Amino acid sequence: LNEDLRLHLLLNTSVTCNDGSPAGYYLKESRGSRRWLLFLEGGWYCFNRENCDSRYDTMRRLMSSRDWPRTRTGTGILSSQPEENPYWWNANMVFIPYCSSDVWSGASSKEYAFMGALIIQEVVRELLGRGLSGAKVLLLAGSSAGGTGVLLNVDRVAEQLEKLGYPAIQVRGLADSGWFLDNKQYRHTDCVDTITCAPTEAIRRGIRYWNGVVPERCRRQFQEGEEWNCFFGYKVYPTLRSPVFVVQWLFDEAQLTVDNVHLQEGLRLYIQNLGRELRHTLKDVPASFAPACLSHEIIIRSHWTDVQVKGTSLPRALHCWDRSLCPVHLVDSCPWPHCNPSCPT
Ligand SMILES: *[C@@H]1O[C@H](CO)[C@@H](O)[C@H](O)[C@H]1NC(C)=O
Numbered sequence: 001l002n003e004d005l006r007l008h009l010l011l012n013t014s015v016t017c018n019d020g021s022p023a024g025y026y027l028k029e030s031r032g033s034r035r036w037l038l039f040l041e042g043g044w045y046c047f048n049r050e051n052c053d054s055r056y057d058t059m060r061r062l063m064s065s066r067d068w069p070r071t072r073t074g075t076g077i078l079s080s081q082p083e084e085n086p087y088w089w090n091a092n093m094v095f096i097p098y099c100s101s102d103v104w105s106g107a108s109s110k111e112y113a114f115m116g117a118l119i120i121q122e123v124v125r126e127l128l129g130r131g132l133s134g135a136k137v138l139l140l141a142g143s144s145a146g147g148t149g150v151l152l153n154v155d156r157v158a159e160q161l162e163k164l165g166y167p168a169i170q171v172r173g174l175a176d177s178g179w180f181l182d183n184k185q186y187r188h189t190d191c192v193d194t195i196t197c198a199p200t201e202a203i204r205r206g207i208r209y210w211n212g213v214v215p216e217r218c219r220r221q222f223q224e225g226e227e228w229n230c231f232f233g234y235k236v237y238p239t240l241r242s243p244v245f246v247v248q249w250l251f252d253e254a255q256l257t258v259d260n261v262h263l264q265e266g267l268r269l270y271i272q273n274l275g276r277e278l279r280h281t282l283k284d285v286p287a288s289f290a291p292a293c294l295s296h297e298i299i300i301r302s303h304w305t306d307v308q309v310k311g312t313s314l315p316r317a318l319h320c321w322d323r324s325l326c327p328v329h330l331v332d333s334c335p336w337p338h339c340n341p342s343c344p345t
């Protein structure tokens with residue numbers, strides 16, 4: 001097929017996936033478009049040697065490029081089909097697979113390797129030779145751990161480009177399902193399994209184990225040793241220099257899982273309070289889209305055009321935002337999961 005994204009493994013083979021195989025990116029160039037969409041894949045993380053070994057058996061794709069296919073079809077925001085992607089089908093499309101298990105924060109060279117931030121850096125620089133140097137807009141986008149990666153890296157990439165001599169390129173971000181709360185769990189549990197570890201504790205261990213770096217402007221706000229705060233969207237958002245659009249299910253499953261909810265009286269309240277706290281953190285975020293659904297991820301799913309908030313679709317909210325650089329602070333007020341009719345299933 002004419003329209004598939006093609007795999008490029010990183011020429012510098014010292015920047016690697018967890019297991020030492022080369023990292024990489026898929027690319028579909030678009031004749032004539034000055035819009036670049038760079039997508040960071042998600043899929044959790046591992047914060048100790050034992051959890052990582054276990055992920056290596058269960059989910060090897062997420063720790064190695066050995067079996068990556070040479071092509072991939074872009075879906076959602078990365079689709080070249082006008083019906084699937086009405087404003088940006090004609091964009092330069094890039095998919096960066098997530099094989100560092102580090103929320104894209106790993107920045108050192110030397111057991112498992114965690115080099116997420118360096119993979120992004122490396123992909124940006126290779127792309128300059130394939131046409132990124134003439135871009136008007138570089139949209140750094142991501143889902144789940146990729147979404148959080150956007151927040152950790154978008155200003156780093158803005159700096160990388162001005163340092164390399166390409167200041168005219170407008171760097172922006174789009175974080176989907178990467179906006180989490182460092183809250184108290186519903187029912188307590190000791191941190192042992194990835195999926196049920198409290199978010200706060202998970203990042204504390206992750207950041208040390210990974211040698212993870214956080215954006216500089218957020219790092220300065222918190223004490224030495226408390227860099228884990230910068231993994232949380234409401235804490236990193238305020239000092240961002242690059243513009244960022246935030247897409248977040250008010251009742252995100254990954255959030256519920258880490259809050260040790262499993263799917264009552266007390267639970268209803270906790271859940272409904274979650275939704276409320278979420279809304280509160282989006283109050284000063286005009287570029288947001290936050291439907292009251294219980295779900296996780298949206299932007300590279302084929303059905304992303306379906307969801308609406310206040311009569312506006314996600315592709316339309318994004319296009320208006322792009323144009324402002326038609327409403328934009330699109331947060332559902334209805335208070336219980338699925339109260340929005342447009343939710344998916
Ligand atoms: C290649 O990547 C390695 C590991 O990050 C880095 O140390 C080395 O300097 C890179 N090569 C360059 C920038 O030429």
Ligand SMILES: [Cl-]
Pocket residue numbers: 030031032
């Ligand atoms: Cl061309």
